Amino acid sequence: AKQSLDVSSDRRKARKAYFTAPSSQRRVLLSAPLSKELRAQYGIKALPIRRDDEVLVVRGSKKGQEGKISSVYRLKFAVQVDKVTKEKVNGASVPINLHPSKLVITKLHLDKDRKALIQRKGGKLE
C-alpha cells in the first residue's frame, strides 16, 4: 500500500486529478505498451503514445487491426488510428476512438528527444 504522506488513496481526489489533468499530464497517462518485439528490442515496457507511431489494437472489437496514429486526442483521452474508422450510413467515414492502454506499439517514431526518452528509461535502442 501507500507508505508516503504525500500520496493520496482518496478516490474523489484521484478522479478529479484525472479528468482535470492538463494536456501535459495526459501525454503520460496516454502511454501504450511496446509490442513483445519492440520491448526486447528497446529494453523498455511502455511509452507515452505520440502521433506518427504504429500500433496494433490488442483489445476490443477492432482487435487485430493495425495502422498509424492519425491524432492523439488528448482532450478526449482517446487516440485515433488512421485506417480504423466507422463507415457511416451516408457513407461518410468517421474516426473510431481508441485507448492507448488497449493498443500496442509496433513501430516507434524517433526524435533526438524520443531517443533520449528511451535512453533515460535505461534501454538499448537498436
Binding site: 500500500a1 488513496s9 482518496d10 478516490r11 474523489r12
Partner: protein
C-alpha cells in the same frame, strides 16, 4: 452549524390560511415564501444538528483491557474457536502453531509466503483473496471500497524483515509480542485468531 439558518425568514403569523413556520421574505424568486429553519422544512435545519463534542472514544480500565486480550490470546489455542472463526486450520499440525525464529529474518515476500505455506497457512491465505468482494454500502465510495476475510496473524519477537516481507500479502497481519493488539486477536470481537508464533516470540510471552 450555520445550515438552514442562512435566511431572514419570519412567521407570517396566523390569519393567512397558511401554517406558522417562518417563511422567506421578498419576492421574484420563489425561494421567497417558503418554510424556513424548520426541521420538517425543505432546506431547514436538521433536528438536533450533529456536533463535534459528541463522545467519540471510550475509556476502558487498563486491567480489564488486559484481561480481555489475555482471554483473546488464550483462545488462539483451542482449535475449535479458531475453526469457528473462519480460519482453515484442519490441515495444520498443532496449535499453538510455533515456527522457527528464523522466520523473523525473511526479507522477501515470496520467501515468506513460501514459509507460511510450508507451515499450513496456505488454505487460510487462499480463503482471503478468494473472498474479496465489493463493499455493499455507500462506504464503497467513502474510501472503504473493497472487502475481504482476515488471514493469519504472524507474531515475532524482533523484526528482521518479516514485517516488511508479509506486508503485501492479502490478509496477513504481523505483530510484535510486546504489543499484541486486542483488535487483531479477536477481530470483530470473535475469539480464536489463527496465530503463527515464532519461537522467540512464543517464549517472550511468559
Amino acid at each position: 452549524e450555520k445550515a438552514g439558518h442562512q435566511t431572514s425568514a419570519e412567521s407570517w403569523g396566523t390569519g393567512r390560511a397558511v401554517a406558522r413556520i417562518p417563511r422567506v421574505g421578498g419576492g421574484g424568486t420563489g425561494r421567497s415564501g417558503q418554510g424556513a429553519f424548520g426541521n420538517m422544512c425543505r432546506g431547514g435545519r436538521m433536528f438536533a444538528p450533529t456536533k463535534t463534542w459528541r463522545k467519540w472514544n471510550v475509556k476502558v480500565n487498563h486491567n480489564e483491557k488486559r484481561y480481555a486480550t489475555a482471554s483473546a490470546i488464550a483462545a488462539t489455542a483451542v482449535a475449535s474457536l479458531v475453526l469457528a472463526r473462519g480460519h482453515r486450520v484442519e490441515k495444520i499440525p498443532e496449535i499453538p502453531l510455533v515456527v522457527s525464529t528464523d522466520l523473523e529474518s525473511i526479507q522477501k515476500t515470496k520467501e515468506a509466503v513460501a514459509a507460511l505455506k510450508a507451515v499450513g497457512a496456505h488454505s487460510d491465505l487462499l480463503k482471503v483473496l478468494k473472498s474479496k468482494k465489493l463493499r455493499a454500502g455507500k462506504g464503497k465510495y467513502r474510501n472503504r471500497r473493497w472487502t475481504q476475510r482476515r488471514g493469519p496473524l504472524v507474531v515475532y519477537a524482533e523484526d528482521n524483515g518479516i514485517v516488511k516481507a508479509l506486508r503485501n500479502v492479502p490478509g496477513v497481519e504481523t505483530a510484535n509480542v510486546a504489543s499484541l493488539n486486542l483488535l487483531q486477536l479477536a477481530p470483530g470481537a470473535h475469539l480464536g485468531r489463527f496465530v503463527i508464533w515464532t519461537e522467540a516470540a512464543f517464549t517472550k510471552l511468559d
